[model samples]
Target: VDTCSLASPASVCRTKHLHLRCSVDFTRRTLTGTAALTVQSQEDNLRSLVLDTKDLTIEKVVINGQEVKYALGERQSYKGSPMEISLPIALSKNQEIVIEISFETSPKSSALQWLTPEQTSGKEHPYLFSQCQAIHCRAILPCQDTPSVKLTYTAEVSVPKELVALMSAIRDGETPDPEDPSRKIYKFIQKVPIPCYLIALVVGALESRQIGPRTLVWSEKEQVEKSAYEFSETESMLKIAEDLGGPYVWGQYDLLVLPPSFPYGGMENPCLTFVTPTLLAGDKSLSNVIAHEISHSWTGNLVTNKTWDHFWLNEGHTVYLERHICGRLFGEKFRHFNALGGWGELQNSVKTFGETHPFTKLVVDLTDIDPDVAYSSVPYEKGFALLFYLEQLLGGPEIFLGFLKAYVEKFSYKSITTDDWKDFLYSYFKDKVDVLNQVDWNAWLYSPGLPPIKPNYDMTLTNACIALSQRWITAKEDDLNSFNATDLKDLSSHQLNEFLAQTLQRAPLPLGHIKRMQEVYNFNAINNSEIRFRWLRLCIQSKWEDAIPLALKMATEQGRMKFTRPLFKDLAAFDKSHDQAVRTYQEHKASMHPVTAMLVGKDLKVD
Candidate 1:
C-alpha cells in the first residue's frame, strides 16, 4: 500500500509467500512453471487482482484451487503486459487468498539469458541465468513486480542431472528424480523476506571451494581455484561489517563468479552474490568489489528502498559502507584515495547524463520511464557525497557511524522511502537543528544536477598522482627529455589510475606523444583493467592504429560495462574505425550479456 512504488498496484492486494516449481528446458529455451502465490487484500470488497508480466504465456489461472478467468492487457515498451485475474467473488478487507498461475516464459523474456555450450567455460553443458533487478522479474513470474513488497519464497527447480543448480535461497538438498534418470530436482528455501528483484537462479556446470568458515566461491571447475583465492577475504569483511552495523542475519555468505558476459559488476542477491569473472586480477587488488557486495548484505538486503525513485537509500549507504570496510582493511588513506577515484566517476556520469538532465538528480523520478535508463553513478557517487558531507557536518565519522548502526537496526527487514530516511534523521538528531537548517532538502532531492556541496577528500595519495600528470604534460610540451619506467615504479594502482584518468580528461594529445608514453611508461601492458581502460580511451581518441587490436580484444572478451561501454563509444566515433567498430561488435555480440549488448547497440547506433 505504499505510494512511493508506482510500478505495481500492490495497494489493493500484496503477496506474502511464493512457491515456485519450474523446469529448466535448454532444448525449448524456456522456463515452464507454476507460481503459487499467497496474497492478502488491503481494500475491502476487492474483486480483481492485476499482476505485472512481460513476454509470458499464461495457460491457466487458478484461484484457491478453482479455475478463474483472466485477460492480458496490452504490452507497453519496457513495462510489459498486465494480467487482470477476475475473481468470481469479492474479498473483504484484510482477507487472505491464494492464486496459482501456470505459465511459460517466452524466449523474448528480458529477465533470462540462455547460452549455448560454447558460451560457457565448460563447453560440455548449456548455461542459464536470470537478471531481474529493476522490473525484469515480471517476465519470469507474474507477481507484484516492485520493491515495495517483500515475500518469502521456496523453489523446486528441475534441471539436467549432469548440471548443477543454485538460487539466492539457502540450499536444502538435491535429489535425482526417480522417474527420470536424466533429471534432478534442487530445492531451496529463503527464510528472509526479499523483494522480487533479488530472486536469482543459475543452472550450469559449477563447482565450489570453501574459502572461509562461512563463505564459499562457486564457479566453473577451471575457475574455481582462482575465484576461491580472490575472495578469501570475504569472511574477514563480514566480521568488519558486522562490527560496524549489526549481526549477519543471512545464514550463509557465498559468491558465484558468473561468465565473462555478465552485464554488471555484481548483483547483491540475498545470500549468494553474483560477480563477474573479469574481477579476477590475479593480485586480489580488485577484491574490494567483494567488500562492496558484502556491505550490501546489511544496507541493501536487510534495509531496502521502498521504490525505485529512492534507490539512493540502498546504494548510497552501501557505497559508504563499502569504503568504510576498505578503510578498515587497508587504512584510512586508501579509503580516501578510493573515494577520490569515485569522484571522477561521478563527474563523468554527470557530464554524460547532462548537467541539467533529470536523471542527474540524487533522487530520481521513474514515473513512466524504465529504471535501467535512469541508473548510473549518480545514485552511488552523488548520494555518497551527500552522506559524506553530513558526516562532516554533524561531528565526524564517530557520530555518523553511530547513526548508521541505529538506522540499520531500526529499519531491519523493511522497505523505506526518502521521507522515511529524513524522518529518521530528524528524530535521531533532534537537538542539532542548526546543522539540519543548513541542508536544502528540496534542492538536493528534486534538483536536476549534482548536489550543492562536495566533500573535501584527503589527498595524501592523489597529490602525487596529480603531480605525475602535470609532469607528463610539462615534459610533452617542453620536449624536455624521455620519460622512463622508473617514473611509475612507486605508483599504486589507484594512483596510476587517477593519473591516467586526469590525463585523459584534457585535450587529446598528439599521436606521437601517446605512442612515446606507451613505449616508455608501458601503460598499455598493465594487468589492471582500470588503468588499461583509461589508457585505451586516450589512444582510441587519437586514432592510434596499434591500440585498435588491444581495444578490440578487451571489448570483445570482457563484458563489464565499466570498460566496454566507453571503449565502444570511442571506437565508433572516428571515421576510419566506424565500420571496424560495427563489425567487431557484430562479430562478438553473442559473447556479451543481453543488457550489455542492448546498451552497446545504442552506442554503435545499431539496431
Candidate 2:
C-alpha cells in the first residue's frame, strides 16, 4: 500500500479480518498455522493476492476448500519474501476472497524467538514470544504486515498443557486437547482493528493476577506477585489516559511482564501490554512506563500510523500523553522534569548519529532502510518537543491537549501520516492559523539535528540536576573537598539519574573523581536499572578498568537495548577493553533476542 512497503507488485489488497489457528511446536521451534485472510479486491481482475513474509515456509494454499498452487517469490532483504496467490479468474471491483494458507515459521524467523528454559524466570519450561513490530509479522503469517492495513483478528493457539498461551487480545476461553490431553488450546478475540504487527503471542509457564476491574498482570509463577504489585496502578494510568485521549476501547488492559530478553521497555500490543522485567523496580518507581503504554491504547492501537516512516505519529503522541498522565498523578513539575531528561537523550542521540544524519530529522526517510537502524530518541523526544512547542505558541495545555483529544477522536479507527496530522492541526486550530504559520515547518520536519526551536520546559527540577552535575564536573583533580557523601543524600532517584545523565553529556570525569563519586553515592550497589546503567557508563566513560566487567555484565544479563547498546559501545570505545566487550557479547549471543543481538553486533562491528 505504501511506496516504502516492498510487497510484490506494490499493490494494496485490504484484509478486513483474519482468523489465525496456529500451534506452537516447542520441540521443533516452529509455529505452524492455517490463516484465513478475508481480503477485499481493489478492482476488476485482482488476479492475485500478494502478501508479505519473511523466513516462512508456505506448505499449501486453499480457496473455497480447494487447494491452489502459489508462487513464493525470491527473498528481499529486510522486506522479506512475498507470496503471490493466483485467482482462478478475474474479479470485479468490491469482490472479496477468503484465502486460507497453511504456513510454518522458520526457526530463525526474526519475528519469533524461542528461548530455552534456563533463559526464562521459571526454569521449568521453555518460552516462545513474537515481536512483529515494524513489518516482522509476515514471518508468523503471510499477510499484509504493514501499519497502513488494520483488521480484527482471531488467535487460537495450542501449547503444552503445562504452560499458558496468551495473545494481544481479550482471552475468551481455553479448551483441553480432545485427543491429546497433554496439550490445550487457548482462544482470543480482538474486535478492535489492529495492524498486523500488533498480532502478538506468548506461550510459557505463566500465571496472571487481577490488578483492576479489567486489568490483569501476567508473568511467571516466580514473579507473579512482584509484577502484580509493580503494576498495581495500571488502572489509574489507564483511567487518566482515557480521560485525556478518549475511550479505553480495548475491553481488557492486561499486562505481561516478559522475560529479560524482551528488547523494549514495553510493547503496546492492542489488549495486552508486554513489558520488560527490568521495570520491576520493587517500589513502583517505573510505573510511568505503564502510563506510556496505556496512552498507546488510543494514540497507537486506535489511531494508527500509516507507515513506519510516520512512526513519530504513534510514539510522539504517546510521550506527550504520557507526560500529561504523569503530570496528573505527580505534579506538572515532574512531567517537565521527565521531558527535560528526554531532551538530554535526544541530544545524545543526535550527537551519536552526527547532527547532520538523516535519521535525526523529525520526518525520516525510511526508503530502503529498516526502522530499527533509524530508531532512536529523536522521534519520541523531537515529536514531543514539536507538540510542546506548538502548545506554547497556540495557547497552552488546555487548548493543545484539546487538539490532541480531538485529533484522536477524529482519526480513531484509521491509519494516518504526518501530512494528515498537519492538515488536521490546521483545520482544528482555524483561529490560530497565523501562529501555526509563524512556525518553521521545513526546519522542524525535514532538517536534521535538534528541533528548530526548543520548548521552554519548567526548569524547577532540571536546574538542580545541572547544578549538582556542574559541582562534580568543576571540582579539580586536586580538590575532593567540594564533594562528600551527603552531596547526593537528598536527591530523588530521578533527580540523581538526571545528574548522571548531565555529567555523561560532558567530558569523561577523571578516574579519581569517578572513584570518589562512587564512594559517596555508592551507585555500585543501586538496584534501579536506570541508575545502574548511567552509573556504570560514567565509570566506563572514565576508563575505570574494574567497571568494564560490571558494565558488560549489565549489558548481557538483561538485553534491554536501551542499556545494552550504549554499554557495549562505551566499553568498545575504549581500546583496552574492546576485545572483552566483544568476547562477552559472543558468550551470551545465543541467549540474547535476535534483534538485540543483531543491533549490538552492528554497534560492535561484529558479524
Candidate 3:
C-alpha cells in the first residue's frame, strides 16, 4: 500500500521477522536462498500475502509445508515486482503466518555486485557486496522492502572457504556446511529491529583488528592495518554519541573498509558500517563519516524514517548528531563551521535541482518517483540546517540536545513518518510550542527549494578563510605578489576547504590567479578528499587545462557519488572536454559500482 512501493495488502499483513538461508555462488554470481517470513495478520480474513521483488527467480512458496499458488506481478523500474502468495484459508487478527519462499538473485540483480579476482585488493579471489538502501533490498530477497516495515533478521550464509561472510547483524557462529563441506556457513542475527533496506551482506577475503573495546575494523588483509588505524577513533565517537543522544543499543559497532567501488562514503548498516577506501586518507581527516554512522546507531538505524519520503528524518537527525559529536571532540567552533559547510552543500544541490523542483522539498513525494533520481545533499544539509535553526530558535544547544535524546528514547525500535516526528516534537518541547508554531512548517516541509529560514552561524573558525578568499576574489592579475603560503599557514585543512568552497561560490577566477594560488598553496598534494574535490572544481571553473586530466582521474578513481558525480560534471562543462569527459567515463565505467555508473551516465547524457 506504499505509494512508491508495490507492497500489496501492506496494511493487512506485517513481517515481524525473517530467517534467511543463503548460499553465495560465485560461478553463477547469484545469491540462492530461502527466506522464511514470519508475518502477522493485522486484519480479519486475510488470505493473500504480497511482497516486493526485482529480477528474482522464485522457486516455490510454502505455508506450513503446503505448496501455495502465487503470482509475480509486472516488473516496475527500481520499485520491483510484487509477489502474491495465497494462503490456505482466511485468518483473523493476531494470527501469525510463516510463509517460506525460495528465491535467487543473479548477475542482473540491482542490489548485488560480484567482483572479479583482479578487482579485489588481494587479487586472489572474487568479492561480493550488497547495497540495498531506499528500495534495492527487494532485488536481493523477496519481502516487504519498505522502510515502513521493520523486522529483525537471522541469516546463515554459505560461502567459499577462502572468503569470509559478513552481514549487518552480529556474527553468531561459523561452521563447516553440512550441505557442502568445501565451503563454510557464517551465521548472523540482528536482535534490533531494522528496516529491510539495512539487510546488508558481503563476502571477501576479509581480516579484522580489534580497534576498540566494542569495535573491530574489517577489510582485506592488504588494507587491514591502515583501516584499523584510520578508524581508531570509533570508541571515542561512540562515547560522544552516547553522551549526546541516548545509549547505543546495538551490541557491537564495527567498520568495514570496502574496496574503492563502494558507492557512498559510508552505509550505516547496523552492526557493521560499510565505508569506502576513499575515507582511508591516512591522516584520518575524513573520519567524520565514522561519527556520522555512529550517530545513526541512534538516529537512522534505531529510530528510522517510516518511508523513503521521510528520508530527512533519518539523515537530518544524523547530521546534527554527528556535528554534536564533533563539537564535543574538537570544539563548538569547528561544529558550527561544519554546519556552514553543510549550507554550502545545500546551495549546490539547490542549484543543480533548481529552486522550485519538487525534489528540493524536505518532505518529498515519492509516489512514483525513484529516490535515487531525486537524491542529493538537499535532504541531508537542509535537514541539518532546519534542526540547527530550531535548536537556536527554541532555546539553545543544551535544550535542543535534550529533545534529541527524548525523541530517540520515545521512538527507538520504531519506524516513523514526518507527521510522527512533528507530533513528537511538539509533545517534547512543551513550553517552546509558541516559538515552534511561529516557525514556518509549510515551506519547510512540503514546499520546494530552500527552506523558509537560515540560521546565522558563528564564523569564528571560518573568519580567516573568508578574509583570505575575499582577497583572492578581488585581486588583480598582477597582484600575485600579494599572496603566498603565509596567508594559509595558520589555516586548518577544513578552513582551507571552506576557503576553496567559498571561492567556488563566486564567479570564476582569472587564469593567472588560479595558477598563482596553486603555486603558493600547493593543494595538489593535500591528502584530504574534501579539500581536493573543492580545489579541483575551482580550477576547472577557471578553465585551467591542466586540471582536466587531474579532475577526470579523481572522478573515476573512487566511486563515492558526492565527489565522483560533481568532478565528472565539472570536467564535462570545461572547454571542449564534454566528449573527452564521456570518453574517460566509458573507459572506467565498468570498474564503478552500478549505481554510480548509471547516475554518471545520466549526468554525461549518455544513453
Candidate 4:
C-alpha cells in the first residue's frame, strides 16, 4: 500500500495508548523492553501500522484477530525505526489488533542507527544520533516503522544509581532500588500518547532544578542553572501556548540539553525534549530555543502528523507556533526579530530549486525525493514562511490564532494526511492557504540543491555596516569602560546582524566580504572578553597571530568554564605559554562539565 502521511512525528496520536517496561545498563551497552498493546484506529480502511524499533529479539508477535508467528520481515532489513508488518488479514470495519513484542539492544552501528559504547577509564563521549542519514531500524525496538499510526508509550529503564537516568514525562520522584546500590530503575511514562519517531530515551548522569512539581534536567549540572534561567518563563510559555489554540496537553516538561555532537538542534520528544549544545548560549541567555521547544509541548507533542513524506506539516506548523511563543515571551517587537528567519527560509527554498530540484511540484510530490538534500531545511524555511504568510494574509494575529486553535481542537491526537489538512483548511477559510497560487509546493518539497532565492550577501553586509555605524555614533571615550561586556560579546552575532541590516539598508559596506566586518572581526578580538574569545577561534582558523593575545586573556579572565576552557586549549597550542589554557580546560574537566569531559583526550564520536 502507498503511504499517505509523514512518519516524522509532529506530536502523539490522538486515540491510541501504549505502556512499556525497559532496562538499560550503561556498562553493558544493552537495553531490553517488554510491552504489549492494542491499537485502536479511527478509520476502518487503514492498511498498515509502523513502529520505531531497533535490531532486537522479537520474542512474540500477534496481530488483527489472528495468532500468527512473525519474524522481522525477511524482505525488509532491520533498521532502528519505521519497521513494517502486514496484517494476516484485513478487517472490514472497526478492526483491532494486539501486539506483544520484547527486544534487547546493544551499542551497535547500521544503516539506520548507532549506539554509544560504555566508557572505558574515566572518559566517554556523549552519545548522539543523526537518523536522517539512513541508519535504519538497527538499534531501537520493533515497529511497522512508518509514520502514520501514532501510539502512547511508557518505558521502565533500570540503570546504575550512580548515574542519573532521564526520559519523557517530567517527574521528580526517583525510585532508587536501595538494595541494589549500584543500580536503579527509572519509570518514564508518557501520558500523552505519541508516535514511534517522537519516542526518545536518554540515560546518563544529569542534574535537575525544581520548578514547583516539575524538575528540569540537563547533561551539564552547572549549565542546568542557565537552562533554568532561560526557561524561567516556562509558566508563561505554557500559558501562551494554550492561548494560541494548542496548549501543553502533556503533563510536566523536561528539556534534555544534550552535549555537542547531537545530530540536530532539537527533537520534540514528548515530555522530555532534546536539544543540542550548539544552541546553548552561555550566561543562560538561550530563551529563543526554549520558546521553540516549549511550543512543541502543544503543536509537536499533542497534535501528531503521520508519515515522513509530509514532513512539512509538522515543521511548518511548529515553526509557526514557535514564532508565536517568541512573540509572547519576548514581547511584541519579537516579530521584527523573525524577519531575518523569514527571509532565510524563503531564500533557502529558492536556493534549493535553482540548482537541482524543480520548484514547480506540489508539496506532496516530495515523497520520493532523495532525503539527503531534500532534508536540507527547505521545508523548515519555506514551508514555515508559507504557513506564516497564510496566517498573516488571513487577518494578522486574530484569524490565524483562532484558526490554529480550532484546527487543534478538531484533530487532536489523530493521524492526518496532507490532503486532510488542505481540505479542512480550505473548507473553512477560502483563499487563505491558496497553495496552488503560491508557487509549486510539490517542487519545493521534493527537490534537492539550493532554491533560486538565496540569501542576499549584499543585503547582509549593508545591515552589518549600519549597526557598526550606530556603535560608532554612540561610542564615546567615557562610555568605553561602561559598555556591557555581555552586550559587546553579543556584537559577534546579534549586533553584527543589526549592523549589516542597517548598512545594507542605507549603503553597502566598504569591504565586500561580510565575514571581515565588525561581528566576524569581533569574533577575533582577543583584547577584551567581549571580542577576544571568538576572536581566538577565527585566529586559529585564519592562522592570525592576533589570536595569541586573546588566547592568553581567555585563560586569565574567562576561567575554566567548559566552553571557554576548550577554547583555551585550542588557543594554547599557539605557543608554549599555554599553561593558562590548560588550567582553564583542566578545571572544566575537574568540575565535570559534560562537554569538556566528553572531549578530554578522546576521539569525537563518528558514525
The C-alpha TM-scores of every prediction are 0.97, 0.98, 0.98, 0.68
Q: State the lDDT of candidate 1 residue by residue for 1-607, as single tens digits.
A: 4322323366788789999999999999899989998888889898888888888999999986789999998887788887888887898988888899999998767788888898899888999989999888988988998888899999999999999999999998999977678999999999999989999999999999998888889999999998988888889999999999999988999999998878778999988999989888787888778888999888988899888888999888999999999999999999889888888888889888898999999887787776776778889988888888889889988899999999999999898989999899988988996899899888887887767877889999889889878777666544635577888889977788889988887737778778888888887768688788889998988779888878888888778888888888888886667798899898876656767777888778898
The list of candidate 2 runs beyond 4 A from truth reads: 8-11
lDDT of 1 at 47: 89
| Each candidate: RMSD | 1.7, 1.3, 1.3, 8.7
Which ten contiguous residues of candidate 4 have the minimum total lDDT? Answer: 6-15
lDDT of each: 0.86, 0.88, 0.88, 0.52
Clashes of each: 0, 0, 0, 75
Top-scoring candidate (lDDT):
3
Q: Give the clashing residue pairs of candidate 2, or none.
A: none
Pairing residues by index, what is the TM-score of model 1?
0.97
**Cα misplacement distance, residue 297 of candidate 1 (Å):** 1.0
How far residue 520's Cα lies from its native spot in candidate 2, in Å, is 1.0
Model 3 misplacement above 4 A = none
Q: List the residue pairs that clash in candidate 1.
A: none
Selected candidate, larger lDDT, 2 vs 3: 3
Q: Write the per-residue lDDT of candidate 2 for residues 230-321, one digit (tens) a residue.
A: 98988888888888998888898899999888999999998899999999888888888999999999998889998888899998999999
Please identify model 4 stretches exceeding 4 Å from their true place: 1-15, 40-54, 59-68, 74-97, 109-138, 170-181, 212-215, 283-285, 331-333, 345-354, 358-373, 431-493, 497-521, 525-607
Q: Whose TM-score is higher: candidate 3's or candidate 4's?
A: 3
Please give the distance, in angstroms, between residue 377's alpha carbon in candidate 3 and its true position after superposition. Answer: 0.9
Summarize candidate 3's per-residue lDDT along 291-351 as a digit string, tens digits: 9999999999889887788999999999999999889989998899999889988987898
